[PDB]
Design an enzyme around this catalytic site. Structure first.
Site, short mmCIF file in Angstrom:
data_model
loop_
_atom_site.label_atom_id
_atom_site.label_comp_id
_atom_site.label_asym_id
_atom_site.label_seq_id
_atom_site.Cartn_x
_atom_site.Cartn_y
_atom_site.Cartn_z
N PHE A 35 -11.64 -7.70 13.80
CA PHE A 35 -10.62 -8.18 12.89
C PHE A 35 -10.25 -7.09 11.88
N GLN A 36 -8.96 -6.79 11.81
CA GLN A 36 -8.42 -5.78 10.90
C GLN A 36 -9.04 -4.40 11.09
N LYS A 88 -17.55 -1.32 5.72
CA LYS A 88 -18.04 -2.35 4.82
C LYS A 88 -19.56 -2.38 4.67
N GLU A 129 0.80 -1.22 0.00
CA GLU A 129 0.00 0.00 0.00
C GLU A 129 0.83 1.27 0.00
N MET A 159 23.63 10.94 2.83
CA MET A 159 23.30 12.13 3.62
C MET A 159 23.60 11.95 5.11
C1 LIG Z 1 -6.98 -14.63 7.55
C2 LIG Z 1 -7.07 -14.86 9.07
C3 LIG Z 1 -7.89 -15.97 9.55
C4 LIG Z 1 -8.01 -16.25 10.96
N1 LIG Z 1 -8.79 -17.34 11.33
C5 LIG Z 1 -8.95 -17.69 12.66
C6 LIG Z 1 -9.76 -18.85 13.01
O1 LIG Z 1 -10.35 -19.55 12.16
N2 LIG Z 1 -9.85 -19.15 14.40
C7 LIG Z 1 -9.19 -18.37 15.39
O2 LIG Z 1 -9.28 -18.66 16.60
N3 LIG Z 1 -8.44 -17.29 15.06
C8 LIG Z 1 -8.29 -16.92 13.72
N4 LIG Z 1 -7.49 -15.79 13.38
C9 LIG Z 1 -6.84 -15.02 14.49
C10 LIG Z 1 -7.87 -14.07 15.16
O3 LIG Z 1 -8.13 -12.97 14.31
C11 LIG Z 1 -7.40 -13.52 16.51
O4 LIG Z 1 -6.17 -12.73 16.30
C12 LIG Z 1 -7.05 -14.63 17.55
O5 LIG Z 1 -8.10 -15.69 17.55
C13 LIG Z 1 -6.98 -14.01 18.90
O6 LIG Z 1 -6.58 -15.13 19.81
P1 LIG Z 1 -6.39 -14.95 21.35
O7 LIG Z 1 -7.67 -14.39 21.90
O8 LIG Z 1 -5.96 -16.26 21.84
O9 LIG Z 1 -5.23 -13.93 21.55
P2 LIG Z 1 -5.26 -12.38 21.79
O10 LIG Z 1 -6.10 -11.73 20.78
O11 LIG Z 1 -3.82 -11.97 21.91
O12 LIG Z 1 -6.04 -12.19 23.08
C14 LIG Z 1 -5.48 -12.72 24.33
C15 LIG Z 1 -6.45 -12.41 25.44
O13 LIG Z 1 -5.80 -12.93 26.62
C16 LIG Z 1 -5.58 -11.86 27.56
N5 LIG Z 1 -4.26 -12.07 28.20
C17 LIG Z 1 -2.97 -11.76 27.74
N6 LIG Z 1 -2.02 -12.10 28.59
C18 LIG Z 1 -2.65 -12.67 29.70
C19 LIG Z 1 -2.19 -13.22 30.94
N7 LIG Z 1 -0.89 -13.27 31.24
N8 LIG Z 1 -3.14 -13.72 31.84
C20 LIG Z 1 -4.48 -13.65 31.49
N9 LIG Z 1 -5.04 -13.15 30.34
C21 LIG Z 1 -4.09 -12.65 29.45
C22 LIG Z 1 -5.66 -10.60 26.74
O14 LIG Z 1 -6.04 -9.43 27.48
C23 LIG Z 1 -6.69 -10.93 25.67
O15 LIG Z 1 -8.06 -10.70 26.04
C24 LIG Z 1 -7.30 -15.41 11.98
C25 LIG Z 1 -6.48 -14.28 11.50
C26 LIG Z 1 -6.35 -14.00 10.07
C27 LIG Z 1 -5.47 -12.82 9.63
C1 LIG Z 2 18.07 15.80 2.47
C2 LIG Z 2 17.15 16.99 2.06
C3 LIG Z 2 17.79 18.26 1.74
C4 LIG Z 2 17.00 19.40 1.33
N1 LIG Z 2 17.69 20.58 1.01
C5 LIG Z 2 17.01 21.69 0.57
C6 LIG Z 2 17.76 22.91 0.21
O1 LIG Z 2 18.99 23.00 0.30
N2 LIG Z 2 16.98 24.00 -0.27
C7 LIG Z 2 15.56 23.93 -0.38
O2 LIG Z 2 14.90 24.89 -0.82
N3 LIG Z 2 14.88 22.81 -0.04
C8 LIG Z 2 15.55 21.69 0.44
N4 LIG Z 2 14.82 20.52 0.78
C9 LIG Z 2 13.34 20.56 0.64
C10 LIG Z 2 12.73 21.28 1.87
O3 LIG Z 2 12.72 20.40 2.98
C11 LIG Z 2 11.28 21.74 1.64
O4 LIG Z 2 10.47 20.56 1.32
C12 LIG Z 2 11.12 22.71 0.44
O5 LIG Z 2 12.20 23.73 0.46
C13 LIG Z 2 9.80 23.39 0.57
O6 LIG Z 2 9.68 24.24 -0.65
P1 LIG Z 2 8.46 25.15 -0.95
O7 LIG Z 2 8.31 26.09 0.21
O8 LIG Z 2 8.72 25.76 -2.25
O9 LIG Z 2 7.21 24.22 -1.07
P2 LIG Z 2 6.11 23.79 -0.03
O10 LIG Z 2 6.73 23.26 1.20
O11 LIG Z 2 5.18 22.89 -0.79
O12 LIG Z 2 5.43 25.09 0.42
C14 LIG Z 2 4.69 25.89 -0.58
C15 LIG Z 2 4.14 27.11 0.12
O13 LIG Z 2 3.39 27.79 -0.91
C16 LIG Z 2 2.01 27.92 -0.51
N5 LIG Z 2 1.16 27.69 -1.70
C17 LIG Z 2 0.74 26.49 -2.30
N6 LIG Z 2 -0.02 26.69 -3.35
C18 LIG Z 2 -0.15 28.08 -3.52
C19 LIG Z 2 -0.83 28.91 -4.46
N7 LIG Z 2 -1.56 28.39 -5.46
N8 LIG Z 2 -0.74 30.30 -4.31
C20 LIG Z 2 0.01 30.80 -3.26
N9 LIG Z 2 0.71 30.10 -2.30
C21 LIG Z 2 0.61 28.72 -2.46
C22 LIG Z 2 1.81 26.88 0.55
O14 LIG Z 2 0.75 27.18 1.47
C23 LIG Z 2 3.15 26.81 1.25
O15 LIG Z 2 3.32 27.76 2.31
C24 LIG Z 2 15.51 19.32 1.23
C25 LIG Z 2 14.86 18.05 1.57
C26 LIG Z 2 15.64 16.89 1.97
C27 LIG Z 2 14.90 15.59 2.29
C1 LIG Z 3 18.73 7.79 6.02
C2 LIG Z 3 18.12 9.10 5.65
C3 LIG Z 3 18.42 9.71 4.23
C4 LIG Z 3 19.27 9.16 3.10
C5 LIG Z 3 20.19 7.94 2.66
O1 LIG Z 3 20.74 7.00 1.49
P1 LIG Z 3 20.67 6.75 0.01
O2 LIG Z 3 21.45 5.65 -0.43
O3 LIG Z 3 19.38 6.49 -0.39
O4 LIG Z 3 21.25 7.98 -0.75
P2 LIG Z 3 22.61 8.76 -0.75
O5 LIG Z 3 22.41 9.83 0.19
O6 LIG Z 3 23.57 7.72 -0.36
O7 LIG Z 3 22.76 9.15 -2.13
N1 LIG Z 3 17.28 9.75 6.61
C6 LIG Z 3 16.33 8.88 7.47
C7 LIG Z 3 15.10 8.15 6.82
C8 LIG Z 3 14.68 6.79 7.24
N2 LIG Z 3 13.54 6.16 6.62
C9 LIG Z 3 12.78 6.80 5.60
C10 LIG Z 3 11.61 6.16 4.96
N3 LIG Z 3 13.13 8.07 5.17
C11 LIG Z 3 14.26 8.79 5.73
N4 LIG Z 3 14.52 10.03 5.26
#
Ligand SMILES: Cc1cc2nc3c(=O)[nH]c(=O)nc-3n(C[C@H](O)[C@H](O)[C@H](O)COP(=O)(O)OP(=O)(O)OC[C@H]3O[C@@H](n4cnc5c(N)ncnc54)[C@H](O)[C@@H]3O)c2cc1C
Ligand SMILES: Cc1cc2nc3c(=O)[nH]c(=O)nc-3n(C[C@H](O)[C@H](O)[C@H](O)COP(=O)(O)OP(=O)(O)OC[C@H]3O[C@@H](n4cnc5c(N)ncnc54)[C@H](O)[C@@H]3O)c2cc1C
Ligand SMILES: C/C(=C\CCOP(=O)(O)OP(=O)(O)O)NCc1cnc(C)nc1N
Ligand SMILES: CCOC(=O)c1ccccc1S(=O)(=O)NC(=O)Nc1nc(Cl)cc(OC)n1
Ligand SMILES: CCOC(=O)c1ccccc1S(=O)(=O)NC(=O)Nc1nc(Cl)cc(OC)n1
Ligand SMILES: Cc1ncc(C[n+]2csc(CCOP(=O)(O)OP(=O)(O)O)c2C)c(N)n1
Ligand SMILES: [K+]
Ligand SMILES: [K+]
Ligand SMILES: [Mg+2]
Ligand SMILES: [Mg+2]
EC number: 2.2.1.6
Lengths: 599, 598
Positions: free
Chosen positions: A119-120, A169, A57, A494
């Site tokens: 669930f989920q 849903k 996602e 960086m």
């Molecule tokens: C695609 C899919 C299919 C699934 N199908 C099934 C299915 O067919 N059947 C099924 O059973 N499950 C199924 N699950 C899992 C299900 O969604 C639940 O996550 C699971 O059943 C929860 O089990 P549980 O209550 O044992 O554990 P938990 O959800 O972790 O709940 C544990 C409970 O015990 C309590 N507890 C924790 N520690 C202690 C402790 N030390 N002393 C006392 N109480 C404690 C907690 O407060 C809680 O109320 C499925 C999941 C997916 C993703």
């Molecule tokens: C490793 C790293 C290094 C970076 N280094 C630099 C650097 O050296 N220099 C740099 O500039 N940036 C740098 N950035 C990017 C920086 O963090 C900002 O994201 C960026 O500078 C923001 O630019 P902006 O203000 O133009 O755009 P935005 O952050 O998108 O802001 C736009 C502004 O314009 C306004 N606005 C939007 N639409 C309209 C409209 N239709 N009419 C009027 N106002 C509007 C918004 O409300 C907002 O206040 C870096 C980022 C990373 C991850």
């Molecule tokens: C680690 C970091 C930037 C850049 C690093 O490496 P990369 O190889 O991609 O590029 P170079 O800078 O080496 O070119 N900052 C923390 C960070 C951690 N996790 C995520 C999702 N985004 C971030 N910006």
């Protein structure tokens, strides 16, 4: 309330399908799940839009962002409840930071099971509250059309951003048994207000006509309107004002134009930073003064603040959101609304300027003194990352095709920004606010879906690529001929750069084991290319761009190369570290010693 | 003394390092980032614990869960701010659903930048509020030791769960200039004790009075070292049948003739029937979720009457009062640690001679409703269930300790059904949240927890794709995990539901897969594939025998339904059973509706 009966008889899922059509949605990125099945059955074989399937996602979310960035339209995401929803939190947080229009639909357990630790089940509305402009859980199918319309409107207005619509849903499976208000099923200024804005515009024009060393600080906001670049240039040409852009502003201004100062900020061009620190008037257009741009805030624009104190300049801000007005630094005039629109209204009030020899001469001296210099290739050495960007930039450009570049996060990202020659708007898609590693690939895929005919290139880093490299197969399944470029330095550049600078070269867990990228690509279904020797770079780059179909090119590059210039800590934008070949060699020696020869 | 200065002079990061030691932490899963750098510099080359690096923070989280599941100790995660933090939301939500002990440390921007829409800033405390037992943002370094101790205590007490500690860069980089209360640095009832006793008593009476008793066991029993032991004791002493939930598998030996197996929508038919006919249900460490109870209004019908006629009903051993009487009304509620109260209640239980009548009916069902499925015919594809059974034996015959992790879907249910569970803490699967991609990273964590164990990940192709990048992490961490992919080239559980409820309309449930073998090879592991029935046995043996990490892809029959099944408004006794004919007719129906594509 006027009623509508056209949806009566349909299921929430079918209504959803119809609304996507009414919202002009031609693409949806998603992943099926139990909770969201009612909607998936409804959009089954639907010809109202194309569906793109990722392996995760998070991929869907980033694809939506890339798509939105390149198309201008909002990116639509459709995932299931629980893990399906939590998996798109990062993309939402990302779209929230960079102001990207995105409508995320997450399936939810039946309303009757909500709150039973079902669930989920997850409190999606709660989790995403802080990383969405707005969110809501649809309570009934009657309410569905409304919520969908509100979502799209909120996502695409003001400062664009992500919104989340939680779909139970039982709601999407339910059949509409009641007529609903006609309004709620259809998409989509004060005279004193426009009067106030015109007043702002006049004041801003007055200041501009008074400025002697003006600078345009352009950001992403200029790109939220088709005419944004056009007007920006007109203003620039009319008043002879040099332009600098943020990372998110690249593409809005033609860097071939003499008045281009290039990017400013932390790793910005010294000339741009210097121009900003010495200007008497800063005209901020669609930029938010973030901390990666301003440097030490108390040292930001000293000349502009002095001009303000003397009432002959300061800072003008064309901002669309009240939240970003006077949030970081105090401004003299804030022109509320759409930047482009207000620039158009203001133009006629701007006095044409013959020339600014003094100002331009000073700027030109800085240009000759501070180019994006670096340690170029030497006999037998590894390929230099910066050199790759410069070369690819030309090769890609010489194809005459529309080029879109996406990137990961890190040094490669900064070098892509610095060394690429930006000219067209909506051609640089990078994560800046949140800075999400792994954004590159999925974003490229989304961008390619948005612009099928464009040459989409993802300039990635090895570490960043690893984060979401699974979407590689998605690219194949979606038929998106993206070009993946990996500047492989076998490190988290960086971070190591910061560890080198502030932690006496102690690289803590910042070097990971990479897989064979070429074999990986081959396994995923793409063409794989690798380059080690300087001599082969040009040939490979050309084959890379020429290859029809998705392709990945790994380029082994030199390691521990710092990105410069650099303004960090309490440094002012004019207190940057400059490239120095002698110092690089010294630092290298010092590094080998400190790391016990490990790096 | 009252005040402690063993930290004055240290940085928040260094204090963090010391606290991990004091908390008996031997492993930390994480990924570095700018905001958390102060802590990473502090734990640089630290010999206080091993560090495991994933390719994605989500991997770290799931590795922490797997580690916690297999070791019993809390899983510690260390990531940076912004994306680093949002990337572990799913693992936290997951650990929250299945009650897994996990302490997540997320770096944060400097307190002075918080709320300014700063670089890589996120309201982590806000985002994770609903998927953590507790969370907090450390305001100052003086407060660090305290918060760390509260985190570990909360994560490991009551019903285990995840907690998050937000660490501002300026706080972890700061140096402790003030001595702090010695209490805060050291890793940390009532008269209700009568109510519990009264309950333990009334429950023992009700049990001694039961005629058709059933032990409905859950994960709670595994949260105590003596759980399984004490569970068998009670079962043997009072001759009671034991059925476990998905998260309960492994707490009861399925070799014991008193084992009903798993209950629920995909549980053994015998188990469901016993539950539906029991006059008394003893719930130990189970929360009655929807995947188990089936249609709540049709659940435990005989237990109800027994309750109405004051001769039985439902006894619930629950640690969390929040889960008592949350789903179904219980007669007796024994609060506290299930294992503890089971020991206290033991003596009050009358040693039953035999329940030949109850067992007669139960054995009658076992003979009638087993885990049947369409077995392999000549030239036909390998059946998923078969692989599971075969691997179960092969793995078992090695005499090594075996730990199984899985993805989410049909393969997960078949692993649960067809594997012969006997040892506790050997089945690590995502059940509450049901996170696809859990398999691989969890296996890695489990292998780190139990270096000598044979760790097998029974995965599905779709689930595997979600986090397949951690494949290289396995190599880097030196975890010789065995990855098994039951490849049906589809999102099985979803296509099953689409086949059942949505007239065989497979909407986006068929992803394009990569070459798993070449993938494995590219990642640095051994890759094996099996297509022919004839080669399955040889491959399974080579699979288990291979030293080092290895991946085996087994092409299995597609569109195979997991049975039995209890969905919709069906009670646990209104399940769908397997029928060779019904299935051949279903296949023909699928072929006709899909033109022949499926
Ligand atoms: C695609 C899919 C299919 C699934 N199908 C099934 C299915 O067919 N059947 C099924 O059973 N499950 C199924 N699950 C899992 C299900 O969604 C639940 O996550 C699971 O059943 C929860 O089990 P549980 O209550 O044992 O554990 P938990 O959800 O972790 O709940 C544990 C409970 O015990 C309590 N507890 C924790 N520690 C202690 C402790 N030390 N002393 C006392 N109480 C404690 C907690 O407060 C809680 O109320 C499925 C999941 C997916 C993703
Ligand atoms: C490793 C790293 C290094 C970076 N280094 C630099 C650097 O050296 N220099 C740099 O500039 N940036 C740098 N950035 C990017 C920086 O963090 C900002 O994201 C960026 O500078 C923001 O630019 P902006 O203000 O133009 O755009 P935005 O952050 O998108 O802001 C736009 C502004 O314009 C306004 N606005 C939007 N639409 C309209 C409209 N239709 N009419 C009027 N106002 C509007 C918004 O409300 C907002 O206040 C870096 C980022 C990373 C991850
Ligand atoms: C680690 C970091 C930037 C850049 C690093 O490496 P990369 O190889 O991609 O590029 P170079 O800078 O080496 O070119 N900052 C923390 C960070 C951690 N996790 C995520 C999702 N985004 C971030 N910006
Ligand atoms: C994962 C979907 O969860 C549902 O929304 C859900 C949640 C709690 C109670 C009942 C349902 S339900 O009975 O309305 N729906 C399902 O249970 N659906 C479902 N879909 C799939 Cl593909 C698999 C599955 O269970 C193993 N269950
Ligand atoms: C990503 C970490 O961000 C910080 O926490 C942060 C946030 C807002 C303002 C100042 C800082 S800071 O000046 O205390 N620290 C940094 O700016 N750090 C930092 N670390 C890395 Cl590895 C890269 C980077 O910038 C490109 N910046
Ligand atoms: C992260 C995430 N996204 C979506 C789901 C919804 N889902 C639950 S079970 C399932 C089926 C697919 O798995 P697979 O690995 O192919 O195995 P099978 O069921 O075919 O054995 C899906 C898509 C989920 N649980 N987690
Ligand atoms: K440039
Ligand atoms: K079994
Ligand atoms: Mg790198
Ligand atoms: Mg599958």
């Amino acid at each position: 309330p006027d009623m509508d009966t056209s949806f009566v008889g349909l299921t929430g899922g079918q209504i959803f399908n119809e609304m996507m059509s009414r919202q002009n949605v031609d693409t949806v990125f998603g992943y099926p799940g139990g909770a969201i099945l009612p909607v998936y059955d409804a959009i089954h074989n639907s010809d109202k839009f194309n569906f793109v399937l990722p392996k995760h996602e998070q991929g869907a979310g980033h694809m939506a962002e890339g798509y939105a960035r390149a198309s201008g339209k909002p990116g639509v995401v459709l995932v299931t409840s629980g893990p399906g929803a939590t998996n798109v939190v990062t993309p939402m947080a990302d779209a929230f930071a960079d102001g990207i229009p995105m409508v995320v639909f997450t399936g939810q357990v039946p309303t009757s099971a909500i709150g039973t630790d079902a669930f989920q089940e997850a409190d999606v509305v709660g989790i995403s509250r802080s990383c969405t402009k707005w969110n809501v859980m649809v309570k009934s199918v009657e309410e569905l059309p409304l919520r969908i319309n509100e979502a799209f409107e909120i996502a695409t207005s003001g400062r664009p951003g992500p919104v989340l619509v939680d779909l139970p849903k039982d709601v999407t499976a339910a059949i509409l048994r009641n007529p609903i208000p006609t309004k709620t099923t259809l998409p989509s200024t004060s005279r004193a207000q426009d009067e106030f804005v015109m007043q702002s515009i006049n004041k801003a024009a007055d200041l501009i006509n008074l400025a002697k060393k003006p600078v345009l600080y352009v950001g992403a906001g200029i790109l939220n309107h088709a005419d944004g670049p056009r007007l920006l240039k007109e203003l620039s040409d009319r008043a002879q004002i040099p332009v600098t852009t943020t990372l998110q502003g690249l593409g809005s201004f033609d860097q071939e134009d003499p008045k281009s100062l290039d990017m400013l900020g932390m790793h910005g061009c010294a000339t741009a930073n210097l121009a900003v620190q010495n200007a008497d008037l800063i005209i901020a257009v669609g930029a938010r003064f973030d901390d990666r741009v301003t440097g030490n805030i108390s040292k930001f624009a000293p000349e502009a603040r002095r001009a303000a104190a003397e009432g002959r300049g300061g800072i003008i801000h064309f901002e669309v959101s009240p939240k970003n007005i006077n949030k970081v630094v105090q401004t003299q005039i804030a022109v509320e609304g759409d930047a482009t629109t207000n620039l158009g209204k203001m133009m006629s009030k701007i006095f044409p300027v013959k020339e600014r020899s003094e100002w331009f001469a000073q700027i030109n001296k800085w240009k000759k003194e501070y180019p994006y210099a670096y340690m170029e290739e030497t006999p037998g050495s590894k390929i230099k990352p910066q050199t790759v960007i410069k070369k690819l930039s030309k090769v890609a450009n010489d194809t005459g095709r529309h080029v879109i570049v996406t990137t990961g996060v890190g040094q490669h990202q900064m070098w892509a920004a610095q060394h690429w020659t930006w000219r067209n708007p909506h051609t640089f898609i990078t994560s800046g606010g949140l800075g999400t590693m792994g954004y590159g690939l999925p974003a490229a895929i989304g961008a390619q879906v948005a612009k099928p005919e464009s040459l989409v290139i993802d300039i990635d880093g090895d570490a960043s690529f690893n984060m979401t490299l699974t979407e590689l197969s998605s690219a194949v399944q979606a038929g998106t001929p993206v070009k993946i470029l990996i500047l492989n330095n076998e490190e988290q550049g960086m971070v190591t750069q910061w560890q080198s600078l502030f932690y006496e070269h102690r690289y803590s867990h910042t070097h990971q084991l990479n897989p064979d990228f070429i074999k990986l690509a081959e396994a995923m279904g793409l063409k794989g290319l690798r380059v080690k020797k300087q001599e082969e770079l040009d040939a490979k780059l050309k084959e890379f761009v020429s290859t029809k179909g998705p392709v990945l090119l790994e380029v082994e590059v030199d390691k521990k190369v710092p990105v410069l210039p650099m303004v960090a800590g309490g440094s002012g934008l004019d207190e940057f570290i400059n490239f120095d070949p002698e110092v690089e060699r010294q630092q290298t020696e010092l590094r080998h010693k400190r790391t016990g020869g490990k790096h």
